[model samples]
Target: ASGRRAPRTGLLELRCGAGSGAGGERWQRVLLSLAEDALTVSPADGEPGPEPEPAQLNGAAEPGAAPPQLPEALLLQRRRVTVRKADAGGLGISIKGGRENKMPILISKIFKGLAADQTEALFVGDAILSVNGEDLSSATHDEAVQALKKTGKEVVLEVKYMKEVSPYFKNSAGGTSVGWDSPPASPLQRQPSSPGPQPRNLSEAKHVSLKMAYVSRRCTPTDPEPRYLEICAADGQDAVFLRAKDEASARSWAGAIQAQIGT
Candidate 1:
């Protein structure tokens, strides 16, 4: 059978977040695509580029070149995150900004080892728009807290984090001001939970030759949801592990890449 695989593109979170020079579980949002011979990952905020030719996939460009510097702004996207209640039973998040401040409710921090933090979906600086269908758009601090603290075994949160506002929030001189983005400093550097080879700097654009690449959809033992994939190149030294926006997207990408490789 003769067929050409259509390219795939979406938000992908790379495992290596140190590329930002921040010491935390920070994953950069990248725009990822798949073609006949290669997969590409670039800044999520930028316009997509033309597909690379086979020659470029074969090292036509300099591999030692310094990686692209992150633009000042990375667009924050809206998504729903499900958090299962822990035995202690709390979202374990610190928040700031509300109706009185003329600002939307923002998550200033996500405490470690808690339900919200464990989801890996929620991040500091994320604005809470709704909780379990209750709108928080015009909520005051106490109202937002009441809605989130209601008795429940599981909670769904609708949130968005505008990366552009991170610096502004961090630099605020307000009395209740708190920094955004990085979590509270910790002595123990938490390692990414996923197991596999990873690039030292995840933000660098990766060109994976599908002809000699291995792609697999992976799921965590604790959750049935498939969030990411591991793609290793022929030489094994070059590998890119990225997480798609959702389960279906990851499956589609895995099949698309596998089909092209005829594996």
Candidate 2:
């Protein structure tokens, strides 16, 4: 007899054929019986089993289908990283991802020099698959927050990033970059901000104010139509409310006050 046994891979695949005729029911029953037996039998001695070759990985990049990308430059990745409070930027990395047809809370930020950034593997777009084994695959905003918060000062993370984020080649000369370049959060040394447009002072208007502020009510307020503006400073305080007779007058003062504050 053939010295072989069935496999226990029946959970997903219920495959049966040739079980036809008078005793087809019985025949199919026999076939189904061994479906789960495949997993039941395994090597007795401790020995390695056959390994699979994948492309990027089994889920997508199964080997033989596409040649391996080989070692070196790649934008996305899946990795396990350790984090500590001290190394982390105060709290920790702000992660976001989702499992629905809406905004998945993908990893939004990993502060510079923090535990996440220090790993040099975390990024702004990584999907937080798990935290210390807690599945965040479908975690809500508050749920995700609690997951991290409960982990205390130290924690571990499982993240999946964009597999092939960058294009085949890169162009640093002059082009519309894909925003991959952070200009490096911690590159050698940094400063507050580079040069840019400076704020300018133009108009000098009066301190005209509002006579009344809108309050919510079904039809009208019981007695809420009286109000005044309060302006205060270190040395003294000023109270005033210029009354506007109509819509036009009200708008004139509104425009002036809004402009004064650069709103």
Candidate 3:
């Protein structure tokens, strides 16, 4: 017999609370099954199992082909987290470094009607700690995603906003002051303009194209490598080919893209 024992997993039964919108009162206890390496959430009235993957049959069966059926014990990994209304406006927490860097927490889009200053106060380097008081640092990625699904109410967040001042820019330990040899000019004073643009040679144009390609790799995904290349391609732009130095480099580039784009 094989030395390793197979994993044993089961479903946990949980009741659904009243949701905020339509069909909200359909209260029922759902069966959430946990497998050795996966989990399945099924309706109480439905059969327990995984949904069937789409079939790629070529033609009709010769004589007695059995119909395809969905598999039992269909497992799914929760890839997002949920936050209740109690956690709205909480600090946006994210992991900065390590192996999980590929899955950086992103809070890109903020809602409209919020004050411009409020939006600007939410700076780039801020490390979110809690929404209202719900701590999210310990929550899974799926949990975090779910937390953002709540609507129709305002939420508060606790955050840590870091403000680092470089030694070259500031002299004091507190970094409150900047030193300058000459007196500062008034805001209304005019400034000098630079020279005009010059014509570019073929080699310079090629270099510029390569630079753009390098930056474009920032938001791409790994395997199966995206069919159409370039973020603008999503809007029907033409595709561009990427030539990696080696297999490892290509893999690394793909991984970086996945982390930035969340697959």
Highest lDDT, which number?
1
Q: What is the TM-score of each predicted model, taking all chains together? A: 0.36, 0.31, 0.21
Candidate 1, position 145, lDDT: 81
The candidate scoring highest on TM-score is 1
lDDT, candidate 2, 1-263, per-residue tens = 43454322111111123223534321111111112111121112235665533213323454332234444322234765546564344455666655455555567876555566666555777666577766776776667767777885556667676656556766543434356435455543332235554221112221222222121111121323321111111111122222233333333333333333331
RMSD to true structure for each model, in Å: 22.8, 34.3, 27.1
- Model 3 lDDT tens row, 1-263: 44544322222222223223545433233332222222233444556565445433533544322222323333221111222233223434333421143333434444452321243435445444455446675554555555443422334334454445224665543322345334576443332224444222112111111111221332232433322112212212112224243444444433443333342
Where is model 1 poorest over a 10-residue stretch in terms of lDDT? 64-73
**Greater-lDDT candidate between 1 and 2:** 1
Candidate rank order under lDDT: 1, 2, 3
Q: On TM-score, who's better, 1 or 3?
A: 1
Query: Relative to the unseen true structure, what is the C-alpha lDDT of residue 243 in candidate 3, on a scale of 0 to 100?
Result: 25
Model 1 misplaced regions, further than 4 Å:
1-6, 17-24, 46-204, 221-223
Reference-based lDDT, residue 142, model 3: 56
- lDDT of candidate 3 at residue 7, scale 0 to 100: 25
How much lDDT does candidate 2 score? 0.40
- lDDT at position 7, candidate 1: 60
**Lowest lDDT block of 10, candidate 3:** 202-211
